[PDB]
Design a protein around this nucleic acid. Structure first.
Ligand SMILES: [Mg+2]
Lengths: 488, 183, 182, 287, 130, 345
RNA sequence: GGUUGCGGCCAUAUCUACCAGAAAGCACCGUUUCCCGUCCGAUCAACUGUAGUUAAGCUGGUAAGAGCCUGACCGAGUAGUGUAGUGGGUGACCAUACGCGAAACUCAGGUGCUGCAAUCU
RNA sequence: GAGAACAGAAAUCUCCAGUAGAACAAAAGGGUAAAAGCCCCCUUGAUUUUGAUUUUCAGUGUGAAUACAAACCAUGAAAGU
């Protein structure tokens, strides 16, 4: 075991003396401080004393008339959120917090037996963290009782690998995609298959996307969008289980499809092209984006989190009526969408060309900004729950953070020793769990841009990781065939 | 975390160390289970698991982890289980209380070599058997077996179950509801 | 509410032992056993000293690891521990230094000659004419093979070999005793 | 077999000595109150607390052999002997041993105003935590008797030495205060022993890093009167205070890089008379 | 063999010298001593820095730096000399393979055994001892 | 070979915290010329490198389209890729590109003098073999041998043109392959330059290496004491080595033999104004602990070393040059008229 | 005040012989399908609290029971020991102080308290 | 000590005593208690690598032993050892 060099005798002598008392008697600011909304609003050059964080929060609350805490950041150089009073017009930039705190995850629970093959995918239920479903190489899929950490309501009927598994935003239906050219819908509370398996695809399903609740008709059930390696996408109606519209604009395998909050569908394909499709216009393409040199992998949107957990929140409270659920989903979508002062959603496209592009498909067809610097292909990209930051995973063992507002690079989360497959954002946006080909999982804290804790214990490569809506539990799955649950 | 089992009752207590004597920070007993709807088998495996979960969640809530604090983070409450003179045998309901406490948020460092269903031929825990034991599956199986065996024993044993009109699946449902109420 | 402490003489701290020394004057009358308020003055002085010591201790740097439980010796990432410096106060040792020295009459020759220390590879040694290693010593040693073998061509020679082993062991013990005599 | 070899190795001296064990010997004249005081005081010394089985007729100042024999047999470097007499009531004699040889002895007598743990406020305490020390009075750092008292108490109550400490372990503080300053010709003021439970509160006068500290005495409260004193010889003092010992211009830079300084000397370019090349000389010209 | 007698002087009759004609690892601080002092000679052209190690799992092989030589059979005096002598176990920089043991203690070094004879080959091949 | 759990044992395992600390140290630590490295403290440098970058080298286009697809009998690339989206953009990017190409062609033609050879059909004469020294195989082999056999390398420089004589080629290899070698500079021939010139040279060169000034002569000299003290200090640093070897690197006729001779205070190494006096390295002992080594003059090949630049240095013997007359304008340019008018009649 | 759990002091807490215990809880008890281990379901593991018993455990009360414990000018500031002086004694010793400083014995008393959580007519 | 076909003064079994006149590596303070004793299950270690003493003849920025320290290892549910 190689050890850090020990301190010298001079270091010991220096440390033996007292110093660094935090009396801070007066610390009267030399320059006035003003509050400005981070988004667009400037709100007033005050000259207060050594006011604490609570005092600043109270001042902002009484300015807003709520005396809703906001996180105070200095001028973005310093870029440091009395915290900033040590460095000395000064402007303090604040953003809504959406008060919540996900307890850091540092311990596992147990190693659970199950599928006799590597785990492939997982997804926590949008409404409760007590139930979760994992897809694995074994043809069967199993739902796990996250409380007791035991299998429950095993899904059977498939005859090939369960490539992808997704949970409906309403939490009433589970959609599972397998290497076989079929998709099956299952009741989470019984495991029964909802009618005959969806069929019509010529090749295995690559990804699944559920229609957002706020766009669905009041009282009706959401549709299910699916993508296949053949390059075609079908919009399946969960009621009739029949694909109303088939789209095959992509000339190669479709990497994934994302259902935007505006009703448009954005998908990446192996043809090095990104296409925007509108469900309203009888499922017809509207625009084509051509900037990636290599194929596009894992297209993502800023609103993905809200759409996934539409009508729900970290508290897990369920809606009473369909109208209330739709209203809550619309409010949740607007909260992130209207952060710019106008209804807009950002889209980030990743590709194996060592570059990622930021797009506003509705506003303009040109890329807003180009994110570059990775040494290898970017496997995974995950927008923050509020769109504040963009994080991407690459095979070069490095994870990079980019500003979600303009795509500017922020920092690189170093520490991984193997290719990073996928990452999942925390509900409060404070933490970020990540998995890599190496033997251990890792979680990063965006606030300090530093590693939070290493989570070893997996016996082989880990391909799947997800964070619960409430943030209480984190699941994972890998080549070891053992499903692991992690929580504070 | 001191867990002791007596006749008709289960005693679980979180205990610290002091010169004047041990001090209890929180305590729970099986006789409080009826508060959550559990009326029979207060000293059984499922009751032990429920009591462990209840005490763990209660102490977690009292400590402020849910719903000199300097030097973040919250420093989760780690506790070591103590069973006194209770024998170390795989499947013992004491290990069931340990599992319940672990599920409740108390991170007791423990291996799965003594949970029910742990086979010696293969070093793997059978989660189905553990779930059955947690949800009183063994009790329901015994009731089903007695349903076609001599009725005198079935009328003496499980007499409370017959009085309350309990059945095989109703026992598991009651245990799940009791766990939810405890939470 | 106030936490700052001011004294005519600065307090001398010993962070390696969590100790603080106060040389300030003390009033004999106030601390006299006959005074009812005797306890209050001592309590206030101790409170001030403890406040100063706590401030100094919290002013020290603290470790912050990113590992997990794993080896129970290491601290969890959630925990952070103050790095106390080495003790400043000198305390007497309970026993003298064990730095006894003796060449045993072997190190002297090994230094005089060019005999380098043996590499100390291991017990394992290849036993020819067989498909097993059977280490030189430690378990089923080959040295015991002569006793278990069947023909000892050229009084039982096995007893002679055992006597030779006993003689060598006794010679080693006698050499150890001779070196201890020095 | 070799089971006792591990115990002998543990007893054997090392470059880093183990935690000193405290042996409490109940004297022949030891009284019930003295026994209770000894038990209360030793409760803070756990897990290094040891109590003898039977009462012992010990006269340390008349014959120190019994103390050395007890230390050798029990391998306890710290010893406290209870003694009670009409002249010396509640006499608690503390003894230190260096290699089983008596290092120093100091007689401490507890005044009748002592308060036991039971009589204090009903508050709890954590066993095994390192106590904090606060010495009051310049005599501790200047008076030989009080210097010896300070050293003995530090060696007794400090517990195990560690370079890393947890904040949660700072639960209680042990305070020793002298009953006022004194000069020559006056009896040595009694030493006041107090133990205070620590409490933390928000201050707002510096933030979380400077919390307000409140105290709650839990005792045991003891007032020690200085009796007979014995001191070690200078040779023993030097031997006990001896570092195990187990480089110029060489510094282990960060990352373990071993760097050596060059330390170039001054260069006097005023020397080195430039070669008088024919070109520089003005004796030859062609203008 | 492997010790070619090298003769020095105008009248070559006082060789006193030995040259290692096989590939050898000489560490990082080699720094040849004065001619008059050196007896065993290992030419620089025969000094290897990076060895080819094949991973038994995944069938992947990588070119990694050599760290040290631990156990060379046949009079391990050669181990002290650092000769490869196929059959020797040498330390390799496994950091590239990203091997991580339980507990988060990523392994950047591990043992490996050379599988090819460097005398007849211009490269070093070893099998990783997983 | 006996089986064991070692060999399949764990030896060098590192922890994440140590990796983070070393990563921070890499960017925090800075080197000082007055300090020299003694031990590298073997570390997984691979896990600490790969600092942040914003280039993202060109993607592997061949993977998306093979060579046959781009062109050939099949040639499925029926259309250009990412071509200009509009005719106006094409015109804008082509009209200016034509002017840029014309300007670049004019700039290149300003130099061509190969145009004379192309037109008149004549060719330049073969480069004289004398101008190719010192670049033989033997001299470079001796240089490498002394470098490997010297714990410290002392580089001599000519005060007249130290930068030209720096011969950076060897220094890069010294820094990369052998960090432990000090590679200390020495400003020789300071007695032939103005004092302020030498002072400025040492001031500007001291920012990277010690660069001790020296004048070499068996008779009265300068810097002998300072260099001896420096060598003694370096030997003291390697106290446990039992010896230290120092090698003299530099251009031919730079005074390496003279430096060694004055250090020995007697005639030890053959010295002559003609370069290449020392043909093979030799060991010289002083103080019983440090040994001096002098290697032949080494010159790194480079097309920018046109014979005029090489000749004015002490690299080449002027005897073998075919036409010494054509070099007089160069010495006129390199020297003021006053100095020649004084020295020359 | 009884009681269960975790303990501190560790015989005023122990040992022998006798007697009671309202409610609750310990305790015995009833069962071997499951987890579990034994030659033995005796021990232990699990189920049952259902068919009972306060017989036993445990708590409490008694013996001028055996031991045990405490305060003490009772021994006692006594014995013993130590240091000093032409005090007497030729010296050793005798008388004094001058500092430590006992115990048997004896007088009188007693035969469990107490820290935290929970529960009971 | 009370009892059991051969079986008695010594064969093996059941019960009540045993402060331990059990075997404890130790003499021995007199210690060791739901053990340091007895019955049963799993287990290699002369593992490496960093630092201060020792040695030499490519003084080996390491080739080795010694001491310390850190990883690793055995066991248990765990504290821990
Ligand atoms: Mg020359």
């Amino acid at each position: 075991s190689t050890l850090i060099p020990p301190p010298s005798k001079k270091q010991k002598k220096e440390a033996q003396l007292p110093r660094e008392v935090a009396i801070i008697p007066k610390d009267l600011p030399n320059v006035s401080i003003k509050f400005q909304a981070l988004d667009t609003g400037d709100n007033a050059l005050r000259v207060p004393g050594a006011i604490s964080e609570k005092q600043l929060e109270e001042l902002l609350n009484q300015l807003n008339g709520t005396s809703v805490p906001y996180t105070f950041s200095c001028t973005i150089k310093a870029s440091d959120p009395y915290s900033s009073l040590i460095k000395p017009q000064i402007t303090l930039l604040y953003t809504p917090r959406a008060v919540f705190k996900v307890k850091p995850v540092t311990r596992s629970s147990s190693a659970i037996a199950g599928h006799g093959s590597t785990i492939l995918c997982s997804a926590f239920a949008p409404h409760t963290s007590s139930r979760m479903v994992t897809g694995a190489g074994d043809n069967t899929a199993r739902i796990w009782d996250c409380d007791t950490q035991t299998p429950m309501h095993t899904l059977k009927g498939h005859y090939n690998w369960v490539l992808c598994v997704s949970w409906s935003p309403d939490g009433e239906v589970i959609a599972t995609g397998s290497m076989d050219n079929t998709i099956r819908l299952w009741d989470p509370k019984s495991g029964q298959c909802l009618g005959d398996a969806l069929r019509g695809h010529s090749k295995w399903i690559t990804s699944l996307s559920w229609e957002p609740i706020h766009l669905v008709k009041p009282g009706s059930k959401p549709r299910l969008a699916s993508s296949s390696k053949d390059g075609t996408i079908k919009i399946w109606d969960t009621v009739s289980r029949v694909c109303q519209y088939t789209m095959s604009g992509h000339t190669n395998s479709v990497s994934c499809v994302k259902w935007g909050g505006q009703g448009l569908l954005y998908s990446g394909s192996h043809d090095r092209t990104v296409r925007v499709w509108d469900i309203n216009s009888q499922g017809r393409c509207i625009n084509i984006l051509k900037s990636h040199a290599h194929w596009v992998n894992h297209l993502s949107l800023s609103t993905d989190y809200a759409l996934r957990i539409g009508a729900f929140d970290h508290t897990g409270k369920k809606p009473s009526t369909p109208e209330e659920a739709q209203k809550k989903a619309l409010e949740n979508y607007e909260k992130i969408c209207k952060k710019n002062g106008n209804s807009e959603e950002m889209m980030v496209t990743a590709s194996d060309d060592y570059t990622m592009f930021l797009w506003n498909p509705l506003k303009s067809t040109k890329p807003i900004a180009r994110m570059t610097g990775h040494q290898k292909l970017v496997n995974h990209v995950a927008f923050s729950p509020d769109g504040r930051y963009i994080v991407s995973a690459s095979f070069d063992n490095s994870i990079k953070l980019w500003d979600g507002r303009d795509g500017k690079f922020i920092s690189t989360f170093r520490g991984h020793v193997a290719s990073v497959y996928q990452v999942a954002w925390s509900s409060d946006c404070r933490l970020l769990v990540s998995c890599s080909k190496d033997t251990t999982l890792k979680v990063w804290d965006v606030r300090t841009r530093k590693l939070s804790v290493d989570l070893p214990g997996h016996k082989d490569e880990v391909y799947t990781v997800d964070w619960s809506v409430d943030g209480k539990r984190v699941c994972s799955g890998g080549k070891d065939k053992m499903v692991r649950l992690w929580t504070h | 975390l001191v867990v002791r089992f007596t006749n008709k009752d289960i005693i679980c207590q979180i205990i610290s160390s002091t010169i004047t004597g041990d001090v209890v920070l929180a305590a729970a007993y099986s006789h409080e289970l009826p508060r959550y709807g559990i009326t029979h088998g207060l000293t059984n495996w499922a009751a032990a698991y429920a009591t462990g979960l209840l005490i763990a969640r209660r102490t977690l809530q009292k400590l402020g982890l849910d719903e000199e604090a300097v030097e973040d983070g919250p420093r989760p409450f780690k506790v070591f289980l103590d069973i006194g003179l209770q024998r170390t045998t795989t499947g013992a309901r004491v290990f069931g209380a340990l599992k319940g406490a672990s599920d409740g948020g108390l991170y007791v460092p423990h291996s799965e070599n003594r949970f029910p269903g742990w086979d010696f031929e293969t070093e793997e825990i059978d989660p189905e058997l553990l779930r059955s034991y947690i949800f009183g599956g063994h009790v329901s199986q015994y009731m089903e077996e007695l349903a076609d065996d001599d009725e005198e024993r079935f009328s003496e044993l499980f007499k409370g179950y017959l009085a309350d009109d309990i059945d095989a699946d109703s026992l598991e449902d009651i245990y799940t509801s009791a766990h939810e109420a405890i939470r | 509410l106030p936490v700052t402490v001011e004294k005519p003489i600065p307090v001398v701290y010993d962070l390696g032992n969590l100790a603080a020394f106060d040389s300030n004057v003390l009033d004999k009358n106030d601390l006299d056993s006959s005074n009812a308020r005797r306890e209050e003055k001592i309590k206030s002085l101790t409170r001030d000293n403890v406040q100063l010591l706590i401030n100094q201790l919290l002013s020290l740097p603290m470790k912050t690891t990113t590992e997990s439980v794993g080896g129970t010796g290491g601290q969890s990432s959630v925990m952070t521990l103050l790095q106390l410096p080495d003790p400043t106060t000198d305390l007497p040792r309970e026993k003298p230094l064990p730095k006894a020295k003796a060449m045993t009459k072997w190190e002297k020759f090994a230094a005089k000659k060019g005999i380098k220390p043996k590499e100390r590879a291991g017990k394992m040694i290849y036993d020819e004419a067989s498909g097993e290693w059977v280490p030189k010593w430690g378990y089923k040693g080959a040295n015991k093979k002569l006793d278990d073998q069947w023909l000892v061509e050229v009084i039982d020679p096995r007893t002679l070999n055992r006597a030779e082993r006993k003689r060598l062991v006794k010679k080693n013990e006698k050499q150890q005793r001779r070196n201890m005599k020095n | 077999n070799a089971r006792a070899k591990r115990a002998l190795v543990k007893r054997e001296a090392k470059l880093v000595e183990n935690v000193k064990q405290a042996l409490f010997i109940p004297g022949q004249s030891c009284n019930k109150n003295l026994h209770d005081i000894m038990v209360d005081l030793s409760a803070l010394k756990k897990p290094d607390m040891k109590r003898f089985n039977r009462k012992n007729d010990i006269h340390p100042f008349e014959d120190m052999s019994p103390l050395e024999f007890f230390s050798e047999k029990n391998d306890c470097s710290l010893m406290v002997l209870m003694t009670s007499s009409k002249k010396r009531k509640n006499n608690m004699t503390f003894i230190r041993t260096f290699g089983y040889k008596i290092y120093d002895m100091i007689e401490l007598m507890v005044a009748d105003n002592f308060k036991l743990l039971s009589d204090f406020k009903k508050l709890t305490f954590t066993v095994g935590l390192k106590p904090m020390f606060t010495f009051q009075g310049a005599a501790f750092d200047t008076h030989p008797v009080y210097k010896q008292i300070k050293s003995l108490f530090l060696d007794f109550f400090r517990g195990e030495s560690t370079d890393l400490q947890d904040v949660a372990g700072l639960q209680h503080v042990i305070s020793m205060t002298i009953q006022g300053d004194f000069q020559d010709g006056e009896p040595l003021p009694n030493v006041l022993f107090r133990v205070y439970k620590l409490k933390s509160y928000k201050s707002d006068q510096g933030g979380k890093r400077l919390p307000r500290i409140e105290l709650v005495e839990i005792g045991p409260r003891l007032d020690f009167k200085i009796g007979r004193i014995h001191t070690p010889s200078p040779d023993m003092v030097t031997e006990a205070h001896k570092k195990p010992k187990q480089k110029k211009n060489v510094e282990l830079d960060i990352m373990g890089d071993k760097l050596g300084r060059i330390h170039m000397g001054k260069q006097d370019l005023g020397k080195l008379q430039t070669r008088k090349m024919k070109g520089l000389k003005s004796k030859f010209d062609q203008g | 063999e492997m010790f070619k007698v090298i003769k020095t002087g105008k009248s070559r009759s006082k060789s006193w010298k030995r040259m290692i004609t096989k590939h050898t690892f000489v560490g990082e601080g080699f720094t040849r001593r004065p001619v008059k002092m050196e007896r065993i000679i290992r030419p620089s052209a025969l000094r290897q820095k990076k060895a080819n190690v094949t991973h038994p799992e995944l069938g992947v092989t990588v070119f990694l730096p050599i760290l040290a030589v631990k156990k060379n059979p046949q009079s391990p005096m050669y181990t002290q000399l650092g000769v490869l002598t196929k059959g020797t176990i040498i330390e390799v920089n496994v950091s590239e393979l990203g091997m991580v043991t339980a507990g988060g203690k990523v392994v950047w070094g591990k043992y490996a055994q050379v599988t090819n004879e460097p005398d007849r080959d211009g490269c070093v091949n070893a099998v990783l001892l997983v | 070979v006996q089986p064991d759990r070692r060999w399949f044992g764990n030896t060098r395992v590192i922890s994440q915290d140590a990796l983070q600390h070393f990563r921070s140290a890499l960017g925090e630590t800075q080197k000082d010329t007055y300090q020299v490295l003694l031990r590298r403290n073997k570390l997984p440098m691979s896990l600490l490198e790969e600092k942040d970058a914003d280039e993202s080298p060109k993607a592997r286009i061949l993977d998306t389209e093979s060579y046959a697809d781009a062109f050939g009998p099949k040639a499925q690339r029926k259309r250009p890729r990412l071509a200009a989206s509009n005719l106006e953009d094409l015109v804008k990017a082509t009209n200016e590109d034509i002017t840029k190409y014309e300007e670049k062609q004019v700039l290149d033609a300003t130099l061509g003098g190969n145009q004379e050879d192309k037109e008149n059909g004549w060719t330049s004469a073969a480069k004289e073999a004398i101008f190719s020294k010192g670049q033989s195989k033997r001299i470079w082999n001796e240089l490498y041998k002394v470098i490997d056999s010297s714990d410290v390398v002392i580089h001599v420089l000519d005060a007249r043109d130290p930068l030209g004589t720096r011969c950076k080629s060897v220094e890069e290899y010294m820094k990369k392959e052998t960090p432990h070698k000090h590679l200390i500079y020495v400003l020789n021939k300071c007695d032939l330059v103005p004092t302020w010139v030498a002072a400025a040279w040492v001031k500007h060169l001291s920012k990277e290496r010690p660069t001790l000034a020296f004048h070499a002569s068996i008779t009265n000299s300068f810097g002998k004491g300072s260099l001896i003290q420096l060598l003694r200090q370096f030997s003291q640093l390697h106290t446990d080595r039992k010896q230290i070897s120092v090698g003299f690197i530099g251009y031919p006729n730079t005074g390496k033999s003279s430096i060694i001779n004055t250090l020995r205070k007697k005639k030890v190494c053959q010295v002559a104004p003609i370069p290449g006096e020392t043909k093979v390295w030799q060991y010289i002992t002083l103080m019983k602990r440090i040994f001096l080594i002098d290697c032949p003059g080494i010159v790194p090949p480079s097309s920018k070393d046109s014979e005029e630049d090489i000749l004015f240095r002490g690299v080449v013997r002027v005897e073998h040059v075919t036409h010494p007359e054509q070099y007089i304008p160069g010495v006129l340019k390199r020297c003021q008229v006053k100095h020649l008018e004084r020295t020359y009649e």
